[PDB]
Design a protein around this ligand. Structure first.
Ligand code: IHP
Ligand code: IHP
Lengths: 219, 209, 219, 221, 209, 211
């Protein structure tokens, strides 16, 4: 990554073995659960395109997801090339060549060029752009790899309400690739067992989740 | 987080993998026991709203508690917007979603936190998060304090352990402790009542040994 | 904690996750064995009252011991307030206010104030004072939670002398006897409670035998 | 490795035990799967030829692959010597002798000479050149140790399409030591080797479908 | 410990949790095998008497050995007081052992010009006591190490020099070579005597391969 | 070890617990396999004689090998004293850290020009470890024969692993090793290898015998 030292310099630093092993183990253990996407975004803090490619390429399995991710990266790179055409001619002294789509993705750019863009005045954050594309692709992968539909989450006859809500919002987070309505509240209240459904319907509209789980604690 | 370097400057630093793994494992292993809230407050030392959202979002399970936490954060953000509705260099004040890192960038968060005077959006957001976590800890407590009664052959030390564990869970005030003397078995209750008021817990546990 | 940087300044540093995990695991694994108190004193090196409260509050179990520790801390704070009365007289124009009992315990003081007292010239080491109180309370807890009395430590018929002396001095360390009481109780109880073989051998060594000679003769 | 410190100096640093153990365990657990090569490239960040030789020599097994790697390194060194004949003359003042093939491989060069080449202005990245050669040899080893041909990857009757594509691009990555492998023949072989149901759906999607659309259309079949 | 930072200054540093855990686990796993003494000497690099007392006091078991070590430290302190009955004050025996000296005084002696290494002296005493403990905790006598009928010579020499290192509290003579050749099984004994006197261990183990 | 700080100075640094534990675990797990010697050379990077003695003395087992190593170190020190008759000049035992202090070792290693007592001692230690590795080698290269159904890759693995063990080195390939390699292969792979002809690289040999 590119981090700031003690002398106030933006310098390049080798990616640590702890970060590599952490990302590899996160992918091995959690597959493409939603919480993988924050973790990735946290483990690639200040990363260069080379570091991002390193994190993605060290994954051994999930090659379908990785190939999808390459297709998404190519789409976003083509859009970047359409919106930011690199002008021909020679580069002025003291200036950097403008990055193509593959330059942001670390395919046709060197590490020295990536450091140059990221530490230039004004900076071109190629690492953050590439990370944005990668996070788009990973959102697609998370939505695709979601196992269960939200319509199939129904509270058991003797299942506690807390576990039912856990499965509900876990499934919803998996299918939306996001933790961010009225249809969700109605689907939530509708799929409860008769007791909790009667209590929740008795609570009236406009109720919060804390009140809902408090009213069904032990029912 | 935003930390002070060995040269005296307040700079931004990437959140360490050990802190992330430590928080994730704390949530996975301890669920929402009370001691999770201090640990969190220690692992988010000097954290920005982005770092707080990172710590909360890396949690895989307990999505009911996390959604409750989002509701609490939205409530506190709406309250902030209600309590905080032109100079040349008048810096913009943070909205509710700006403190929560929803509508603010890392550059803006560092801007508020390092301004003169500073607006510690990280500490405010951490205050809201700790409120929500207090609610979650209070709800996830298994037993009520009124249901903590000393067994016929239960040692007094274990009974006090369960008593103050449950009490700590439900109080995420001082008159509740009176229940400790009331819910003891007849022997220990008679001895403790004989000790009178002003008796410390050490004397109580010694008298019932 | 408060540590020294490169330019010789005493600055505040966030408590590391390794120290937190080390303290939590020490409490979980060793309960309130005596060696926990030195370990604590080592893990809280240079700690502020906030850091000490963090270390105490991260303990999940032993809430009876933690409440006892809170009572002891309140006692020592009240004694501090008794020994340092707030004087009603002429204060110097640059006279900094002295910390109260609750200020040293981190209850009514902020982190900036704690750093202020600890880094002042001359310093008021509120962290070391609070750590002294906490170590007093932990001493009480260790003394109370000691399972066996020293009078009940008797060498087994086939128990090796090394294991018997190990249990003897472990129990003695747990009960915390003064050097005179530990020397008398050690001289009479140690030799007296040995099995007939080791007792005969030890008696054959003559008076004034050191523990090394006693354990060598019974090997 | 040669890294930059807090004061912006390029200094030599002893290779860390964590990097050594990480590389050794990666070789022990993953053998010569493709993902080993990126990992290597990450663990040898800023490495000198001496550090590269250290990482390669700490490998205990796979001595056939290691000896092959020595042959590849010697070939690339001979090619370097063919492309850069050092002039039989005296070294200019304030300069360094140009590195031969064995100098880049750390065989006939000292650590101080490697630091000299790597920290000179302009630098001669002997570590990056040697790493390029090593990555060539490791690419050969990965392609050779690939167990299955891409032609033998056929979707099972009840195998999910996601697992079939996983095995497909995993095998293809192993056989090419690369992930930029998706062309026309791979897309047609991919659609062709699917089970009748998924093959009918994929052909019904039409030409030019993305992999996301292909796996979405065959989800739950 | 007192270590040198990146700016060439000798400063005091808090003992790291990794060193504490390393020492505690070394004592728990290896007990008082000889190799514990070098490890200790490595983990107490640059340590003050306070740090040494910290390392010794964190040991939970082996309280007999710890009391022995305390007695040995008191003996060496009494000997130091016997040898030492703008002039800086000299440290007494209890000052070197960290009993009657503060951390400020220890740093004062250790960082003076010329330095008075109270930490290295205390470490010398502690290593003496630990040598005593290692010699006592040795399980087997060297005279009882005899090569088995089908035991390889390499394993026999391993046990031989492990036991010898345990009873010497050091691995650094001729009676050991004669006892070694004497304690071999008949085959290896005939081969070793056929090698002749003055044979090195490499030749002895090579001849029995 | 002696490492470089921010002011460009060579200063002494306490040996880390992770390096000690790494070396101890390497000895416990790998015994005296050849790859231990590079690992050692990497874990003692910039080490002082005191640090080298620390790494060697923390080994709990293999006391026969450690005593052999002590004998080799004493031989190399006596030879150093014979070749260099007498800051004070270092003796053989001074380089081995026996009769020298840490301050003296730092003095020699940080002098201009430096006297690398750590690198000399490390050379001696690596000599002794080479002896130990060659002795602890289990099998002779002449006993490595390809099984009837053993893949050629595994046979070459055992071949060059055994050869590396018997020479304490990887630079071992020559004409005798190539002819012994082709000779000890099973009839099928031997026929294919003979069909390749001379000058065939190991890559071509392993490709021709695949499957
Ligand atoms: O006190 P800590 O926060 O736990 O700092 C440690 C310490 O780093 P510094 O002393 O440089 O701050 C370790 O250094 P050692 O002395 O053990 O070598 C280092 O380990 P490395 O040697 O592997 O650099 C480790 O870093 P890592 O996280 O990469 O394990 C890092 O811990 P933090 O990174 O968590 O601060
Ligand atoms: O001495 P230990 O308490 O057993 O500490 C180890 C050690 O961690 P540290 O050296 O950072 O304290 C391992 O680190 P390695 O050098 O083996 O890498 C680490 O393993 P990881 O590398 O996987 O982090 C492991 O952690 P884990 O529990 O996740 O296996 C952790 O053990 P504890 O966590 O029990 O302290």
């Amino acid at each position: 990554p590119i981090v700031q030292n003690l002398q106030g310099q933006m310098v390049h630093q080798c990616i640590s073995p702890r970060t590599l092993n952490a990302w590899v183990k996160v992918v091995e253990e959690k597959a493409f659960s939603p919480e993988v996407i924050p973790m990735f975004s946290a483990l690639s803090c200040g990363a260069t395109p080379q570091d991002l490619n390193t994190m993605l390429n060290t994954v051994g399995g999930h090659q379908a997801a990785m190939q999808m991710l390459k297709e998404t990266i190519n789409e976003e790179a083509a859009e970047w090339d359409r919106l930011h055409p690199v002008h021909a001619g020679p580069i002025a002294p003291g200036q950097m060549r403008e990055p193509r789509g593959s330059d942001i993705a670390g395919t046709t750019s060197t590490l020295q060029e990536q450091i140059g863009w990221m530490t230039h005045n004004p900076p071109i954050p190629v690492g953050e752009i590439y990370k944005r594309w990668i996070i788009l692709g990973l959102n697609k992968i998370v939505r695709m790899y979601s196992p269960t539909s939200i319509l199939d989450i129904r509270q058991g006859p003797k299942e506690p309400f807390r576990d039912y809500v856990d499965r509900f919002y876990k499934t919803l987070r998996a299918e939306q690739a996001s933790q961010e309505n009225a249809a969700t509240e109605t689907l939530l209240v509708q799929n409860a067992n008769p007791d909790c459904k009667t209590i929740l319907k008795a609570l009236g509209p406009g109720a919060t989740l804390e009140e809902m789980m408090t009213a069904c604690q032990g029912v």
